[PDB]
Amino acid sequence: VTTLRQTDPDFEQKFAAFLSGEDVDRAVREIVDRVRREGDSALLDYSRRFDRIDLEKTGIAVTEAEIDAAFDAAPASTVEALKLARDRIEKHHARQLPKDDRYTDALGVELGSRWTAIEAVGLYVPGGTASYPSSVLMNAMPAKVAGVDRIVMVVPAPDGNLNPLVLVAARLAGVSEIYRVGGAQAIAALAYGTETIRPVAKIVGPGNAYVAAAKRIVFGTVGIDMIAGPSEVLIVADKDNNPDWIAADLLAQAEHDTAAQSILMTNDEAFAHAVEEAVERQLHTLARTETASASWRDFGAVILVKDFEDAIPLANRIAAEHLEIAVADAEAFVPRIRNAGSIFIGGYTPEVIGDYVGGSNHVLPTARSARFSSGLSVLDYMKRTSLLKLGSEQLRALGPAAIEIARAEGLDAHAQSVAIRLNLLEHHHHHH
Amino acid sequence: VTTLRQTDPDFEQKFAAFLSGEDVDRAVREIVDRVRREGDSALLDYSRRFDRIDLEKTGIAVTEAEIDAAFDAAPASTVEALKLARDRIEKHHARQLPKDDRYTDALGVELGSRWTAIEAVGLYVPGGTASYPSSVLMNAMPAKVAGVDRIVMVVPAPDGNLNPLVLVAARLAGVSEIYRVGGAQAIAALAYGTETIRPVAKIVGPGNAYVAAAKRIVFGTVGIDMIAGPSEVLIVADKDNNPDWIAADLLAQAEHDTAAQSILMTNDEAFAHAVEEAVERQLHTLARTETASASWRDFGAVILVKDFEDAIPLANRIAAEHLEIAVADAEAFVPRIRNAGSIFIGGYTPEVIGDYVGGSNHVLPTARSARFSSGLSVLDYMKRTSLLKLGSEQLRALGPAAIEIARAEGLDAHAQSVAIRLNLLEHHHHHH
Numbered sequence: 088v089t090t091l092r093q094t095d096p097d098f099e100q101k102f103a104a105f106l107s108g109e110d111v112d113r114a115v116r117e118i119v120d121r122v123r124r125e126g127d128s129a130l131l132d133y134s135r136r137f138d139r140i141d142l143e144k145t146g147i148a149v150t151e152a153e154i155d156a157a158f159d160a161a162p163a164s165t166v167e168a169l170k171l172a173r174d175r176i177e178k179h180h181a182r183q184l185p186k187d188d189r190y191t192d193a194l195g196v197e198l199g200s201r202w203t204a205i206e207a208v209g210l211y212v213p214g215g216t217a218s219y220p221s222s223v224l225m226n227a228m229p230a231k232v233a234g235v236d237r238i239v240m241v242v243p244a245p246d247g248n249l250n251p252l253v254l255v256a257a258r259l260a261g262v263s264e265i266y267r268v269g270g271a272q273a274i275a276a277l278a279y280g281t282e283t284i285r286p287v288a289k290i291v292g293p294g295n296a297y298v299a300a301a302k303r304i305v306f307g308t309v310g311i312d313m314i315a316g317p318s319e320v321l322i323v324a325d326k327d328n329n330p331d332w333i334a335a336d337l338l339a340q341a342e343h344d345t346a347a348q349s350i351l352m353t354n355d356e357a358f359a360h361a362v363e364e365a366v367e368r369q370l371h372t373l374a375r376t377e378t379a380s381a382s383w384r385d386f387g388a389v390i391l392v393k394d395f396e397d398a399i400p401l402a403n404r405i406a407a408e409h410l411e412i413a414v415a416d417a418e419a420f421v422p423r424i425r426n427a428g429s430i431f432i433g434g435y436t437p438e439v440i441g442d443y444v445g446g447s448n449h450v451l452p453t454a455r456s457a458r459f460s461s462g463l464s465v466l467d468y469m470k471r472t473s474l475l476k477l478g479s480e481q482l483r484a485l486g487p488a489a490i491e492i493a494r495a496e497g498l499d500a501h502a503q504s505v506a507i508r509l510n511l512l513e514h515h516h517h518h519h
Numbered sequence: 520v521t522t523l524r525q526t527d528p529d530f531e532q533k534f535a536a537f538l539s540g541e542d543v544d545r546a547v548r549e550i551v552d553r554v555r556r557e558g559d560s561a562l563l564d565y566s567r568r569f570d571r572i573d574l575e576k577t578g579i580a581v582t583e584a585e586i587d588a589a590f591d592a593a594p595a596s597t598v599e600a601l602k603l604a605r606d607r608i609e610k611h612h613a614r615q616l617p618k619d620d621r622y623t624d625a626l627g628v629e630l631g632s633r634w635t636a637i638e639a640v641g642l643y644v645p646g647g648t649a650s651y652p653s654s655v656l657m658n659a660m661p662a663k664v665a666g667v668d669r670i671v672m673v674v675p676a677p678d679g680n681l682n683p684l685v686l687v688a689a690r691l692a693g694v695s696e697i698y699r700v701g702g703a704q705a706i707a708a709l710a711y712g713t714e715t716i717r718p719v720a721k722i723v724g725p726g727n728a729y730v731a732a733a734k735r736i737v738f739g740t741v742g743i744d745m746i747a748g749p750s751e752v753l754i755v756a757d758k759d760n761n762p763d764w765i766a767a768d769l770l771a772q773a774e775h776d777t778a779a780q781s782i783l784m785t786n787d788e789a790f791a792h793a794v795e796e797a798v799e800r801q802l803h804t805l806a807r808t809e810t811a812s813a814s815w816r817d818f819g820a821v822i823l824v825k826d827f828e829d830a831i832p833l834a835n836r837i838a839a840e841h842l843e844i845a846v847a848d849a850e851a852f853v854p855r856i857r858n859a860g861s862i863f864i865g866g867y868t869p870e871v872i873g874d875y876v877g878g879s880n881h882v883l884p885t886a887r888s889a890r891f892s893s894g895l896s897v898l899d900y901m902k903r904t905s906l907l908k909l910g911s912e913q914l915r916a917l918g919p920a921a922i923e924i925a926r927a928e929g930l931d932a933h934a935q936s937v938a939i940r941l942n943l944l945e946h947h948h949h950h951h
């Protein structure tokens with residue numbers, strides 16, 4: 088598969104090219120506007136059109152009765168595994184809850200930082216085969232931990248089919264309402280609201296091209312997590328690893344999407360060869376290797392470096408969603424590689440564990456977005472409010488400076504709101 | 520001016536209406552794509568076209584020499600006031616720096632949360648009269664405090680004119696590079712990079728319709744703070760306030776933009792009348808009341824409630840950028856009003872103080888965005904990376920659950936990356 092050699096005088100050009108990489112807009116714009124202006128009426132319309140479903144009969148909201156039945160149908164070990172994941176995710180996220188900060192500075196000004204949960208959030212969950220209960224837990228649990236009052240999930244049911252495990256996960260994660268809708272129409276319903284779906288304040292959850300374009304439109308009206316990009320895993324490993332294990336980790340990622348990218352960065356060419364052979368073999372032992380195969384062939388890559396000091400700047404440019412570090416003295420590289428959504432350390436930490444039961448959130452920054460964003464955390468479901476309180480002495484002390492800047496900015500009304508107070512106050516400060 | 524009465528049987532309908540509220544897209548899409556595909560060449564083109572400037576002569580980058588001269592021209596008291604603001608903003612933001620969190624749970628799994636600064640950020644600063652040095656400090660200081668390696672500012676110079684105070688503030692706030700460009704073309708240059716402007720990882724700073732549309736396009740390629748909306752102030756006050764002071768606070772906000780909104784929520788109609796009279800009078804004592812007057816007439820409003828318990832849900836729906844609370848026992852309402860970008864407490868805390876020297880950031884969530892976002896903080900210039908490390912015992916303990924979920928999701932490659940390790944490992948755990 089694609090192999091880049093840092094040796095190569097053309098390595099940089101090739102590497103930069105490797106790192107690089109429509110009218111749906113028009114269509115989405117109309118769908119979103121129509122749902123906004125018309126409501127439930129437009130939702131059903133678009134739902135029939137895209138999900139071949141008749142919500143007037145199935146109903147838009149999933150019932151607690153339908154959720155109860157999903158639990159029954161589920162294998163006991165599946166429900167228990169989901170509960171273990173829910174518990175581990177909750178405990179870990181609880182630790183990240185922000186603490187308020189109220190204090191008084193040297194001048195006596197009272198400054199404060201207070202956090203509150205967003206009142207209502209909507210989680211978008213793709214339907215059909217891409218419908219994962221693990222994703223429901225990852226997206227919903229932080230909201231529940233944060234204290235979000237109302238957590239809504241929208242999940243389309245093409246041809247009327249919903250994954251029962253998604254309903255099981257939803258309940259476990261504290262999801263309040265569930266609506267059988269998706270696409271740009273569901274995003275529009277959550278942002279603007281309809282007769283059946285009261286609006287929410289933020290929408291999280293990756294979707295297809297129609298969902299992404301709709302999220303771009305509504306951003307500002309509601310908060311949004313980020314626009315989904317192609318998923319990836321960067322594995323930095325030396326020869327002292329089991330080639331079969333590394334190949335398995337690369338293929339796990341690859342089976343997600345035909346556009347998923349798996350990358351091996353190593354300093355041992357022979358080992359790179361061993362991993363490739365393992366990928367080829369496993370590609371045959373496993374079934375349904377249609378997607379994985381396509382992903383590995385079209386986007387897989389090996390990057391050969393002389394040593395791992397060289398791998399550092401390259402790993403930072405890749406800014407992978409998931410980074411597995413399997414080299415000696417692995418801990419020593421963690422601080423050096425600043426751009427990575429999640430880092431998995433050692434041979435016994437396949438990234439897959441993080442997708443499910445580690446505790447950290449698997450909703451991570453993709454497509455180089457790790458250069459500027461973090462994976463989902465309770466902070467994404469909360470907001471900070473600044474608090475400020477000045478007494479007469481404080482205003483007397485900081486007011487002149489404020490007035491000076493306001494006037495230099497030509498904002499006379501701004502200067503006057505301070506001046507009007509100081510003019511009166513000053514008559515008590517003629518001794519200094 | 521516009522007065523709403525919660526008494527009114529039609530209050531809710533009127534209030535909801537009061538709370539509500541193009542082809543630029545096509546144009547911006549082309550500008551952004553052209554700058555992306557063509558670089559510096561397109562930047563100059565668009566700069567001549569929109570700023571009537573010839574960058575081939577003035578140069579794109581502002582020189583340290585040009586920055587030095589800006590300092591000289593500035594009044595000593597203006598430079599000192601800006602330094603006081605810079606210092607107060609820095610001290611306050613420093614307190615908000617995140618702390619990493621590495622720990623070991625009961626099963627022995629090592630979980631970690633680590634924070635790093637974004638490597639490079641670009642700050643967009645409008646040109647001409649809307650060019651505020653205070654805004655430069657507010658946008659740049661948190662980045663400097665966060666440890667951002669490269670801080671770039673783009674500020675257009677229509678007809679070749681730049682506000683010297685913007686250059687003064689830039690230096691004080693740790694801005695590294697400054698380019699004389701703006702609009703969708705500057706946003707495109709920062710996101711995709713040109714021969715002269717190396718790309719950045721995140722762009723912050725409100726702009727006009729062209730900038731906002733460009734930011735919506737590049738979101739995902741680079742992080743963005745939020746799309747600017749109309750500015751506002753909500754003042755909740757009882758009769759025990761100086762009507763002139765309250766009027767001044769409303770007008771300070773109003774002078775910002777003809778679309779700025781100032782709102783008085785009170786439980787005393789006579790007092791509301793007194794404030795209105797003060798607004799009218801001050802509207803004549805102050806000069807350049809062209810914008811303020813337009814803002815107050817077109818968007819000003821008084822909301823009359825019976826008591827402040829009633830004001831709470833209304834204030835939460837307004838979700839104001841700035842909220843001044845001037846009533847008895849003010850501190851008691853702070854926790855009750857969860858949606859507000861910044862809260863100013865008491866009669867001696869005009870919001871204007873926060874714009875300048877309080878310490879908190881004046882880049883705040885507007886247009887009801889306080890329902891889901893926070894004002895700018897060091898966290899906006901940093902990102903969290905999750906760390907996970909499992910030993911053989913831990914994988915043996917959590918692996919089965921992972922495998923179970925993976926298989927229930929039909930992700931056999933995912934299950935195999937865990938199974939391949941457990942199969943080998945299990946041969947050491949036949950005693951339990």
Ligand SMILES: N[C@@H](Cc1c[nH]cn1)C(=O)Cc1ccc(OCc2ccccc2)cc1
Binds near residue numbers: 294451930
């Ligand atoms: N390792 C995964 C997490 C995980 C979930 N289940 C197994 N692994 C990850 O962190 C990235 C990721 C997240 C969501 C996701 O969405 C599923 C989807 C696929 C195709 C179309 C629509 C929706 C796709 C990728």
Ligand SMILES: N[C@@H](Cc1c[nH]cn1)C(=O)Cc1ccc(OCc2ccccc2)cc1
Binds near residue numbers: 498649726750775
């Ligand atoms: N109170 C102000 C902060 C402040 C700055 N100087 C005085 N007050 C606030 O927090 C909100 C705000 C921030 C930036 C801003 O941008 C200036 C601008 C105006 C028109 C077109 C383009 C740019 C406009 C409003």
Ligand SMILES: [Zn+2]
Binds near residue numbers: 393396
């Ligand atoms: Zn080297």
Ligand SMILES: [Zn+2]
Binds near residue numbers: 339439442933
């Ligand atoms: Zn996965």
Ligand SMILES: [Zn+2]
Binds near residue numbers: 825
């Ligand atoms: Zn009441």
Ligand SMILES: [Zn+2]
Binds near residue numbers: 501771772775871
């Ligand atoms: Zn202001």
